[PDB]
């Protein structure tokens, strides 16, 4: 297995054989475009008429394809196909106790009516994350669960939990121009921790205005008192967002009707859309943000009781 070079009329493609080659190439050409499944880049070139004169393909690199079971969760190389993620998670769910698989189960829910087998066999985990579509069904789950991202360049290596800061603006991530996403660790669920994910069953615009969410709550040991709460939404803005103002107010509150009211009041306010908001469906989307939390609220109650 060696590095290969292909030269087109407009584009040069390098097939990287090792991680070291990849980080060197990325340092030599920071503007070089990574391609794994091409399920986003292909669309960008065809329909958004972007041109990337320099492309690197890291799909051959071990790491980036590795699946690792650790103390805190399951780690996937960033080039892992969504089908491989789905398979690994389905096995984990079948094998492990329900209370450790809340986050996995949420990932699997988002993968249920997602594309087709054709797309899922080539679309990478890392590509979905870095594409950073406002309507990504996975980013809200990763954000709400604090999934860990390992990010590397020639010299640098850092692990960050995914949070609100990771998506600064439209289609942008908190990566350096020379950085690549190496791996993603999806956490095991802890005791007194519950997770849900939901998505709108309609899409009408290319990458806006489709509601999708990740929702997590952690209780104080053996109670219904909130220790942590995270509600993250796609399709409500130009990026994946967290309802931080609203959830922060619920800390040390109890899981009851009053919390349901306060969260709903908070969400209606924090996530409010202008009449002219891109994508329209203004009433519908607001209603979904609330109805999804309601579903989560009742699910958490069934899981508590």
């Amino acid at each position: 297995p060696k590095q290969l070079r292909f030269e087109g009329e407009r584009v040069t493609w390098i097939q990287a054989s090792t991680l070291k080659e990849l980080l060197d190439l990325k340092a030599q050409h920071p503007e070089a475009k990574l391609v794994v499944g091409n399920t986003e880049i292909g669309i960008e070139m065809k329909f958004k008429n972007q041109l990337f004169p320099m492309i690197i393909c890291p799909a051959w690199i071990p790491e980036l394809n590795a699946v690792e079971h650790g103390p805190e969760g399951i780690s996937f190389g960033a080039a892992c196909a969504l089908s491989s993620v789905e398979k690994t998670l389905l096995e984990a769910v079948a094998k492990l106790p329900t209370q450790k698989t809340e986050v996995f189960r949420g990932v699997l829910e988002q993968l249920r009516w997602f594309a087709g087998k054709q797309v899922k066999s080539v679309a990478s985990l890392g590509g979905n994350i870095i594409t950073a579509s406002p309507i990504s069904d996975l980013n809200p789950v990763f954000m709400a669960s604090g999934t860990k991202l390992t990010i590397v360049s020639r010299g640098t290596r850092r692990t960050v939990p995914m949070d609100h800061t990771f998506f600064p603006s439209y289609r942008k991530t908190l990566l350096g121009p020379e950085e690549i996403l190496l791996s993603i660790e999806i956490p095991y669920s802890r005791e007194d921790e519950f997770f849900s994910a939901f998505k709108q069953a309609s899409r009408r615009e290319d990458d806006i205005a489709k509601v999708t969410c990740g929702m997590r709550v952690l209780f104080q040991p053996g109670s219904m008192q909130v220790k942590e709460l995270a509600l993250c939404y796609g399709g409500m803005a130009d990026r994946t967002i967290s309802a931080l103002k609203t959830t922060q107010k619920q800390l040390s509150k109890f899981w009851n009707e009053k919390l349901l009211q306060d969260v709903c009041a908070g969400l209606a306010e924090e996530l409010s859309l202008s009449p002219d908001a891109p994508g329209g469906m203004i009433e519908f989307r607001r209603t979904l943000t609330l109805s999804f939390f309601f579903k989560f609220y009742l699910t958490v109650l069934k899981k508590l009781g």
């Binding site: 009408r204 009211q261 009041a265 309601f294």
Partner: protein, 756 residues
Amino acid sequence: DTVGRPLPHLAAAMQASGEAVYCDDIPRYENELFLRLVTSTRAHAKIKSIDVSEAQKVPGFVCFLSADDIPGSNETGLFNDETVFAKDTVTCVGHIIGAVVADTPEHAERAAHVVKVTYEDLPAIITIEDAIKNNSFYGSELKIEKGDLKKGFSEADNVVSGELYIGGQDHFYLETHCTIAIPKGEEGEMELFVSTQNAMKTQSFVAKMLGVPVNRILVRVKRMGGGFGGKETRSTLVSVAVALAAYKTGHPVRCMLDRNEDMLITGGRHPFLARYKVGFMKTGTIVALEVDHYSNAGNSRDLSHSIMERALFHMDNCYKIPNIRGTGRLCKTNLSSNTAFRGFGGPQALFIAENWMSEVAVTCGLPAEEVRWKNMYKEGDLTHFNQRLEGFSVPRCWDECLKSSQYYARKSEVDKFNKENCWKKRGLCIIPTKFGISFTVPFLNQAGALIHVYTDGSVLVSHGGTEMGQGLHTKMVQVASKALKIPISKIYISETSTNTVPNSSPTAASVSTDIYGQAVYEACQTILKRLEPFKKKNPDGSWEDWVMAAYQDRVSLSTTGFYRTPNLGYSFETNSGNAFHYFTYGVACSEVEIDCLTGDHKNLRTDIVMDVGSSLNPAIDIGQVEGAFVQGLGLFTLEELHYSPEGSLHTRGPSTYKIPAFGSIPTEFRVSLLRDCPNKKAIYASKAVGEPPLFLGASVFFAIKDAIRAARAQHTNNNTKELFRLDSPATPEKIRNACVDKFTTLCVTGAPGNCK
């Protein structure tokens, strides 16, 4: 004799093996070029300039074609109100301005993207409401009136008035528009391979643009990967451009549209707005109806007038209404011109009818099936256009569907489900349909065939009809085989071509089996008459023996056949004359479950009973019923086209436009063909099946509306007879918004609100 047998579509094996050739699968000539259309990005604007400087730097660029390059005429379209290439003004977002020609389709694509157009915007009209407010219509009002509306409304116990909108639809044929044009370099001659339902108009329009006689132009159609009406006229947008490129370069040229181009440029089903008023008795019996229809026709006439005519013919559905007035207007707007789509105005008019009928039942507080049944026509009644209903089989379909679907039992189960469930609800509905069979334009009801018998006894049949997946060629082979009393293995149909059967009507209106079947039958009778003396001389001889005897006796083994539908010609000025040859009937019952919190729904079970006379081929016919129904399911519940305020289409591919998927169809999906109902009016007692079943997809819409009603009784008010407007399609947005509760109102937040 295979007539009445479920023979697989003749090309099915070849289609499954990828051996069946579609237009773009035809091999390229060594010198063949590729064309890409350049299209408007503004709804309404003057073209100030077209800059091709950067396109010329694309490797393999050949030329840019505009209106100035046309040798004959730049005036085109069914009513000569269109341009081949826009000259001074553009009148919709995918309005064709020119084309790039290059050595590869990738190069054509690249070059077309780099063509710069400069515009000066003009005031645009996009919505039906916009057009109404601006008096922007094609032609005048169409109207059918019967009885006395004042009087009917006087006698009525209740009156309900309202407004309804039904969104359009993209054809989404899997094979997009495609033409190859081959210039011969002699005498203006050109041969074209085209994915079209209308070879005649393709031929005419090409000839007109080039300024050459129609006899110079040969158009050939082997098969289409779907048409659904979208290739009845709008295919000429591509055909004429490719022909010009072939003319200009002297090379073969081809173009197949990308999905996003096709959806933008080629038009769809007409959206309709209706304003209606119905007067009825406390019994549910209808006494007066007034409906004003408006269609969004887009930026040319095309088939919009005939579509509206068909809509007015179907505003009764299956119901006798003694005092009736329907009108229709065509809205002239800055949107791609809308066109034929399976059903042709029928589904829109039938949807409007079922909507007010649903409101009658709710207002009267009576079961929907009872109100429908009470108002149904009887055998021998006259329609609102004074045509007698001979062989009215809806009552039989209705009763068979009620029985086989176990409607009354399942109705009790739906009620039990709704009692026990708070945030999910079920709905169930049964709907009838009737669909008039014949082109609304009397002169199009004509068909030709040409049959040759070769000296080995093998038979080649050609007819005016085109194969688009409906199994027309299969049926014609079954007919020919029965008529001639020889096995189907002796008969072949190769393609449709303008040099074998000239002046063919478009393959449309669901009548191709009827009219080409009759034309083939007649040609077969001629051959049989010619062979009879030889059969008489040698009665224990084979077909082959008789054919060779005829040949050696210098008897011609080639003949034309022709059929013209008798007794047609409705007059809007007398409200008399037959509009249709006969009617196809059907009934569908559907059950759904809605998620009141998300607006998502599940199709649980559908039962369909269709009157298709004595089916020529039950497998093809059942396949037509199932396919049409699913397209109707799409129309009423899934498929939604969305435009920017500036009139630019947002939904241009499968990611943003959702047609029914494997997972969309009812879990239990049952289709029955009605038994023992031969049709005396068509070939071997059969009836048209292509278009009639599509409207039955509305059973799902009205089942959803039932479920919403139950949701509203749960969480919104206490008013059982409340009418709420539900426009089509019933997308999750519409369903969710209709389920008014503590979330939609924000009562869940502590605010006061309009729920219980």
